[PDB]
Write a protein that binds this DNA or RNA. Structure first.
Lengths: 103, 182, 48, 48, 79, 136, 126
RNA sequence: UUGCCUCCUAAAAUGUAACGGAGGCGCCCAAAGGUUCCCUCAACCUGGACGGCAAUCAGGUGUUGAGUGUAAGUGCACAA
RNA sequence: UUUCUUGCCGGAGGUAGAGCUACUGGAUGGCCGAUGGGCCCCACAGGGUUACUGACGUCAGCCAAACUCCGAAUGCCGGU
RNA sequence: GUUACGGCGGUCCAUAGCGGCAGGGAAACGCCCGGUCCCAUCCCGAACCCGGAAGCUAAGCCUGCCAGCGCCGAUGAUACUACCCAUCCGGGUGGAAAAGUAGGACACCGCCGAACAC
């Protein structure tokens, strides 16, 4: 069997860092880093609302179709930095999911 | 022209015996006895050093080598023993001397034990060798019943190149060690 | 238990050195070879 | 062997009960001995 | 009450006295320490109290040889 | 009750009440937990009171973990004394709680009773705390 | 099949030689002007290399292996004398007069002592 | 309590107070100094005689875990 | 101008932080449950229901000024 | 100049180590046979030292492959932090970890001298 890779828009970050990440979290966009077999890491800003919806829907372990500027890339959430107080997703680690590889 | 009986017998037939029995893959794998270490810890040295003196004399007679006066590793109060106090007598025999010491042992002293029913293989101590502790020293025929002073008892460790307990047991059996392997 | 001892050269009897031994561990007058400057060579030095 | 500080070592003859005289180097000054119970005489070693 | 404490030795003013890149004469004290936190390197000697000093002139250079921090003097060619 | 069998140093500086907890900030033993939201020295007195509250509420059944341990000693110089003459002797043992630390945890079938017991513990406690759950 | 439970005497000797050599090198270095004459000793042969720890590059070398030393009959210490002579010639020709002689972690005396004495008589101020 | 040494206080150079938190010191060395050269220590058995948690020198095994004359540190297994 | 500021560069450090299965000290559960107690066969022979201390520890997640596998930011020394 | 080469060295000395699976001794490296000799054991030719090549690549050393233990390890994010704004809350710019993750790694480099080649 399989699980539909939940659709989720992602945008490459124009500015990466502490100030950029805090501004993004205010805007409602969680920062994430896509890495894995893809060799080169990519820095993304997912939508906080949609991503939390996806997570609370399909558990922490779910496959995401990240739309990076209109490029379906399958990934999974391997780490979720969650602020212990605000409880908001603080940051995401996204392991590229090769269509045809095990993790 | 000069070769001890046990060494000659070993090199001649025990090598073939072990090769054939254990399908060793090389002569260097074919085991071979290594130093025979005769230990004896007087223990009561804290009360009398003449005890360790007599122990040294007994070892010198038996093994034929000036024993080493092995001190104590550290001071333990419960034993009334302090570090640097001489507590044991050591002797190391190698080569022809160890071979013939084993010959003497096997063919005179072990049969001269009081009520003996063959050595203990269950405590064979394979990898290391075979450490069996005697109850008395007079059993060693070489020292005289007139010259003995006190029950001493020994610890003979026949270190071998035996890779494991089975191979060591085979080696010492072929050597002759009468075990009570039942 | 450990006095200030003065070692003097046996040859010129010049008190050259001041050490401390232990009067108990080494009660005998200390003997060690050190050179008097006026002699030049290391000569036996003994307690005063 | 450093020197003669070890007990003198010399060949020796042991005439056991079975008659199998063994020639073995030992520190017995005299160089000759006899034993009533040897390997070939003991029950267990002989086959008892 | 009464505290049984209240004592402390005079601070010995240890540490590095010449840092990497400082040019030193032949004999300057490069480091003061109680053990050998830094070990003596090339043209650097260790004194009785574990003081690292310059055996030869030149610039101090902190390196590592076999997992031990070391103080070296690299010669300065006269221009 | 909760007292260290031995502390290397009996008299220690006041633990710093700064920052959000870096560890123990999530339920890891039980179903529910009491998460702190303010800094405080949670004394062993308070821990005992809260634990007894939870155990008596949940009555018979259930399991309660006490993540924090009051291992930090706080001294108290003898009563009616002037400033000086050395540090007071240890008087009460506390656990340095920081916001986001899960102090207690509970596993009990009835969610209603579990939440009630945790609320009673929070009442016994000297700070704001919330009933967090394992389910994220 | 086989399980060498202990550490073979070859391993023990190699490690111990390396340790003795390391503690020796803790004081002996060998500089271009005063190279280090390292000596390796084997049950069959003896080798020597004038090394320069600044460069880590050997300046000269001799060994009992050479056909000349093999032709020189006698014993191991005779071959050691000959190799000491050869390395002395090679070093002198290189331009090195003084050296510091490294035992290689072995003991004084024997092949190594004969080699050092031969080099000294040959002309190495080491 | 007063002098000296070590640590933490002491805010990653140095230094930094309190009747702050801890301890040591008013010595031992003729070897425990110098030097040359060698060695590594803890912890468990194939196994052991009176021998036990602990002796042995049992190395047979085992990777630098003890030991530094003495408080504390900084060091020392390359060894200190 | 050696002063100071700023940029750059060479530095050492063990603070904040964090980690501790990297040490020294305080903590949830199964594992062996080894050393042991009753039951034990009442024999000290032999073995397990062994709710028990259940150790050294094995394996899974948490704290320290006098803990450190680590470790900034500043500050400091020096060069330009 | 080529080697399942031996030594001497370097690395900000584990990306190198430990462990495992397979392989070879040509010169060498080793094990290995002895103690007559230099020399040696707080006893022992075990070690050290001395003579030989009878035997063996079984070990040591070295070759290839294993990512199993250890080792390294990002990028992001976070903690922390210099300065600044801010009436308690916080925030900005610059720096930025530890841990963890992706992963890397079963070493790399220099000198000689060996056997063959030239």
């Amino acid at each position: 069997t399989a699980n539909i890779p939940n659709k989720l828009t992602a945008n490459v970050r124009t500015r990466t860092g502490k100030g950029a990440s805090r501004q993004a979290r205010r805007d409602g966009k969680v920062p994430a880093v896509l890495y894995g077999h893809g060799t080169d890491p990519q820095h993304l800003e997912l939508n906080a609302r949609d991503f939390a919806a996806v997570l609370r829907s399909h558990g922490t372990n779910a496959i995401l179709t990240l739309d990076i500027e209109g490029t379906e890339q399958l990934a999974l959430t391997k780490a979720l930095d969650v602020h212990p107080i605000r409880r908001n997703i603080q940051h995401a680690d996204l392991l590229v999911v090769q269509r045809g590889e095990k993790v | 022209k000069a070769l001890p009986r046990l060494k000659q017998r070993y090199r001649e037939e025990i090598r073939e015996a072990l090769q054939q029995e254990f399908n060793y893959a090389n002569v260097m794998q074919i085991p071979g006895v290594v130093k025979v270490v005769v230990n004896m810890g007087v223990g009561d040295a804290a009360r009398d050093a003449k005890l360790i003196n007599g122990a040294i004399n007994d070892l010198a007679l038996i093994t034929g080598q000036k024993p080493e006066v092995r001190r104590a590793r550290k001071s333990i109060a419960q034993f009334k023993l302090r570090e640097g106090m001489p507590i044991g007598a050591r002797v190391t025999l190698r080569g022809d001397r160890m071979w013939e010491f084993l010959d003497r042992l096997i063919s005179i002293a072990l049969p001269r034990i009081r009520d003996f029913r063959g050595l203990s293989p269950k405590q064979f101590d394979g990898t290391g060798n075979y450490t069996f502790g005697l109850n008395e020293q007079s059993m060693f025929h070489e020292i005289d019943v007139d010259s003995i002073d006190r029950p001493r008892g020994m610890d003979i460790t026949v270190v071998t190149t035996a890779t494991n307990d089975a191979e060591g047991r085979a080696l010492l059996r072929a050597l002759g060690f009468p075990f009570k392997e039942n | 238990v450990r006095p200030k001892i003065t070692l003097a050269c046996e040859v010129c009897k010049h008190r050259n050195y001041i050490t401390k031994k232990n009067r108990r561990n080494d009660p005998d007058r200390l003997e060690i070879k050190k050179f008097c400057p006026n002699c030049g060579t290391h000569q036996p030095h003994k307690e005063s | 062997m450093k020197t003669g500080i070890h007990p003198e070592y010399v060949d020796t003859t042991v005439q056991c009960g079975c008659g199998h005289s063994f020639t073995t180097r030992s520190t017995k000054q005299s160089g000759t001995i006899v034993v009533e119970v040897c390997s070939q005489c003991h029950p267990f070693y002989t086959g008892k | 009450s009464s505290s049984r404490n209240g004592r402390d030795s005079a601070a010995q003013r240890l540490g590095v006295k010449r840092f990497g890149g400082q040019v030193v004469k032949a004999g300057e004290i490069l480091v003061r320490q109680r053990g050998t936190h830094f070990h003596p390197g090339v043209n650097v000697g260790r004194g009785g109290d574990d003081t690292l000093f310059a055996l030869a002139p030149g610039a101090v250079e902190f390196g590592a040889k076999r997992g031990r921090k070391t103080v070296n003097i690299v010669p300065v060619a006269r221009p | 009750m909760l007292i260290p069998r031995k502390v290397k140093h009996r008299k220690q500086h006041h633990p710093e009440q700064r920052g959000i907890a870096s560890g123990g900030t999530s339920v890891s033993f039980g179903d529910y937990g009491i998460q702190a939201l303010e800094h405080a020295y949670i004394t062993n007195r308070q821990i005992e009171s809260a634990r007894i509250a939870i155990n008596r509420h949940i009555k018979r059944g259930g399991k309660v973990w006490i993540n924090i341990f009051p291992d930090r000693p706080l001294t108290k110089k003898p009563a009616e004394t002037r400033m000086g003459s050395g540090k007071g002797s240890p008087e009460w043992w506390v656990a340095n709680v920081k916001p986001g630390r899960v102090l207690f945890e509970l596993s009990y079938p009835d969610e209603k009773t579990a939440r009630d017991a945790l609320t009673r513990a929070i009442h016994k406690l000297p700070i704001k705390a919330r009933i967090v759950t394992r389910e994220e | 099949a086989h399980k060498p439970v202990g550490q073979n005497i070859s391993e023990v000797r190699r490690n111990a030689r390396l340790r003795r050599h390391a503690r020796l090198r803790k004081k002996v270095a060998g500089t271009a002007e005063v190279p280090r004459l390292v000596v390796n000793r084997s049950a069959r042969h003896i080798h020597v290399q004038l090394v320069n720890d600044l460069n880590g590059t050997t300046l000269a070398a001799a060994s009992s292996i050479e056909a000349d030393v093999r032709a020189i009959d006698g014993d191991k210490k005779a071959h050691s004398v000959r190799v000491g002579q050869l390395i002395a010639e090679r070093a002198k020709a290189a331009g090195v007069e003084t050296v510091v002689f490294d035992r290689g972690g072995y003991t004084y005396g024997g092949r190594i002592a004969a080699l050092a004495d031969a080099a000294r008589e040959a002309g190495l101020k080491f």
